[PDB]
C-alpha cells in the first residue's frame, strides 16, 4: 500500500507583514515537494530525486495552485478572525493535510482532507467523500458554504481521479527507492556508567521506510517500559535512525538481545553486545 499527502501551514503575523503559507508533499515517508510564500518568488519545488523528472506544466501548474491556495488561506485567516471575533493583534495559523491511499493494485483505498485553526481540528472531509465534519460554530459557517458550493463533490473527483492517478505514477517513477525497503544497519554499544551499571544501546541506522520496531529483550523478555526509545529521527539522507537503550547491571550484558523488525529485513535480526 502507498500514500500521497500534502501539508499546508498558513500563519498570520500582525505588525510583521502578510500571512506566511508553507506546503509540503509526501509519497509514503519521502518528502517530494515544498512551497513557501515567504520566498522572494514562491515555487512548488522538488525534494526527492524521482520527482525531478516531472515536466514544467507540472511545476507551473503546482505553483499556480499553491499561490491561489496561499491567497484563499490569507482570506480564510481573515474569515476565521471574524468568525472567532479575534483581535487583529494576534498571530494565527491554519493547517491542512489531504491526499489518497492506494492498495497494491493501485485502486483508491481512502481519501483525506483535514484542516486545523491554531493547532486544533477545524473541518475534515468524511471517508464517504460527500460530507464534512466541522469542529465548532465557526467551522459550521465553512461547512454550509462548502455544502452550498458542492466542495465535497469536487474533492471526491480529485481524490478518486488525479490523486490516485498521480500517486500510481510517482510509485512507478520512484520504484527503486519507494518500492525497495532499505534495511537498518544495526549494532549494540556498551557504556559503563559506574563500576556496577552499563548502558546497552541498540542502533538501527539508515533504514527506509520510517516504520521500525526496535526492542530489547532480557533472556527473551520484552523491556519496552525500561527502554529509552528515541523518536524515529531523520538521518538527513531520507533514511531514518532509531535507538533503544537499556541501563543494565554489570554482568548481565550477555543476556540482553536487541530485536529489529523492518520491511527491508527478510527475517528479524537478533543482536547482542559483541565484546
Amino acid at each position: 500500500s502507498h500514500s500521497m499527502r500534502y501539508f499546508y501551514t498558513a500563519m498570520s503575523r500582525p505588525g510583521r507583514g502578510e500571512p506566511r503559507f508553507i506546503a509540503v508533499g509526501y509519497v509514503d515517508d519521502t518528502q517530494f515537494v515544498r512551497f513557501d510564500s515567504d520566498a522572494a518568488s514562491p515555487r512548488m519545488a522538488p525534494r526527492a530525486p524521482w520527482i525531478e523528472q516531472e515536466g514544467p506544466e507540472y511545476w507551473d501548474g503546482e505553483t499556480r495552485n499553491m499561490k491561489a491556495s496561499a491567497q484563499t488561506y490569507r482570506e480564510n485567516l481573515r474569515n476565521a478572525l471574524r468568525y472567532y471575533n479575534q483581535s487583529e493583534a494576534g498571530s494565527h495559523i491554519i493547517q491542512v493535510m489531504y491526499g489518497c491511499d492506494v492498495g497494491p493494485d493501485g485502486r483508491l483505498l481512502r481519501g483525506h482532507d483535514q484542516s486545523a485553526y491554531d493547532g486544533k481540528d477545524y473541518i475534515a472531509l468524511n471517508e464517504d467523500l460527500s460530507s464534512w465534519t466541522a469542529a465548532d460554530t465557526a467551522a459550521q459557517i465553512t461547512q454550509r458554504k462548502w455544502e452550498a458550493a458542492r466542495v465535497a463533490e469536487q474533492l471526491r473527483a480529485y481524490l478518486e481521479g488525479l490523486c490516485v492517478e498521480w500517486l500510481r505514477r510517482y510509485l512507478e517513477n520512484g520504484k527503486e527507492t519507494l518500492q525497495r525497503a532499505d534495511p537498518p544497519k544495526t549494532h549494540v554499544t556498551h557504556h559503563p556508567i559506574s563500576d556496577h551499571e552499563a548502558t546497552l544501546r541498540c542502533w538501527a541506522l539508515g533504514f527506509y521506510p520510517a516504520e521500525i520496531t526496535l526492542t530489547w529483550q532480557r533472556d527473551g523478555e520484552d523491556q519496552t517500559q525500561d527502554t529509552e526509545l528515541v523518536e524515529t529521527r531523520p538521518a538527513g539522507d531520507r533514511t531514518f535512525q532509531k535507538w533503544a537503550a537499556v541501563v543494565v547491571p554489570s554482568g548481565e550484558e550477555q543476556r540482553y538481545t536487541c530485536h529489529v523488525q523492518h520491511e527491508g529485513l527478510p527475517k528479524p535480526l537478533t543482536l547482542r553486545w559483541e565484546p
Binding site: 512548488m44 503546482e62 495552485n65 491561489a68 491556495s69 482570506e75 468568525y83 459557517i141 466542495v151 480529485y158
Partner: peptide, 9 residues
Amino acid sequence: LSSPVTKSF
C-alpha cells in the same frame, strides 16, 4: 499532484 479545489472558509 495537489488539489485544485477551492476551500474558502
